[PDB]
């Protein structure tokens, strides 16, 4: 997250670290036995992480927890990043509690303006390179579907939804691949991609959650 702030430890207490001996992409836990995550994450041998802040010090919160199977999203695109969400079972259920939580899917999408809560492990620069050990939030709205597609033309499908600040400065980097963004109590977007981080005209691109929730309940439901 570049530009944001220390969200304060377990103040998102659905945001998951997925690690394979290093933390390389968030997620978001959505009931005691699933997360969701973005398809560009997908590998094999991913131990879910809960609880976190300081993702190097076990602070005491923390449940870690092996994925059983990934599911990445039937018509995901490598190439176009079209359909960037996969599904993460855990082996055994987590156990819920104030900083261990699920955030509910959305009943609808949500509006362009609507204010968003981003987070992340991610790089804290725009150009070179700071890991932060502690969970940093970006507050932002989603933008409107023409600013997005001006700043991508060609490259922004009904999938995807832009949201930040086109004069740069703040905005999710990598790291935060995978990982929420909350807008009005819901998961409306994943961390997806875009051109550098915090950019001038060049927002972050979301896998736009709500048109998955369909998938997402009958995958379950079946898994
Ligand atoms: N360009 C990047 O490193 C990146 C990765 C994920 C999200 C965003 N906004 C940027
Ligand atoms: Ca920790």
């Known amino acids: 997250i570049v530009g944001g702030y220390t969200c304060g430890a377990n103040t998102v207490p659905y945001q998951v670290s997925l ?34 802040d300081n993702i190097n010090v076990v602070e005491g919160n923390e449940q870690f927890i092996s994925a059983s199977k990934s599911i990445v999203h039937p018509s995901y695109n490598s190439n176009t990043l079209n359909n ?11 156990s819920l509690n104030s900083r261990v939580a699920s955030i ?16 992340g492990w991610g790089n804290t620069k725009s150009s070179g390179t700071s890991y932060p050990d502690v969970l940093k939030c970006l507050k932002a709205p989603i ?8 700043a991508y033309p060609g490259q922004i ?18 790291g935060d691949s995978g990982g929420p963004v909350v807008c009005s109590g819901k998961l409306q977007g994943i961390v997806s991609w875009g051109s550098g981080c915090a950019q001038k005209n060049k927002p972050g691109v979301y896998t736009k959650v709500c048109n998955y929730v369909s998938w997402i309940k009958q995958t379950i439901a079946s898994n």
Not at 143 to 150: A, E, Q, V
Request: glycine residues 10%; charged residues 15%; contains cysteine.
């Open 19 to 52: 690690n394979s001996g290093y933390h390389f992409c968030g997620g978001s836990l959505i009931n005691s036995q699933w997360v969701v995550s973005a398809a560009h994450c997908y590998k094999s041998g991913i131990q879910v992480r809960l609880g976190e």
């Open 143 to 150: 933008l409107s579907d023409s600013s997005c597609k001006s």
């Open 84 to 94: 960037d969400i996969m599904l993460i079972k855990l082996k055994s259920a987590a």
């Open 104 to 119: 509910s899917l959305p009943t609808s999408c949500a509006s362009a303006g609507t204010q968003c809560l981003i987070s």
């Open 157 to 174: 499908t009904s999938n995807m939804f832009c949201a930040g600040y086109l004069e740069g400065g703040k905005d999710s980097c990598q």
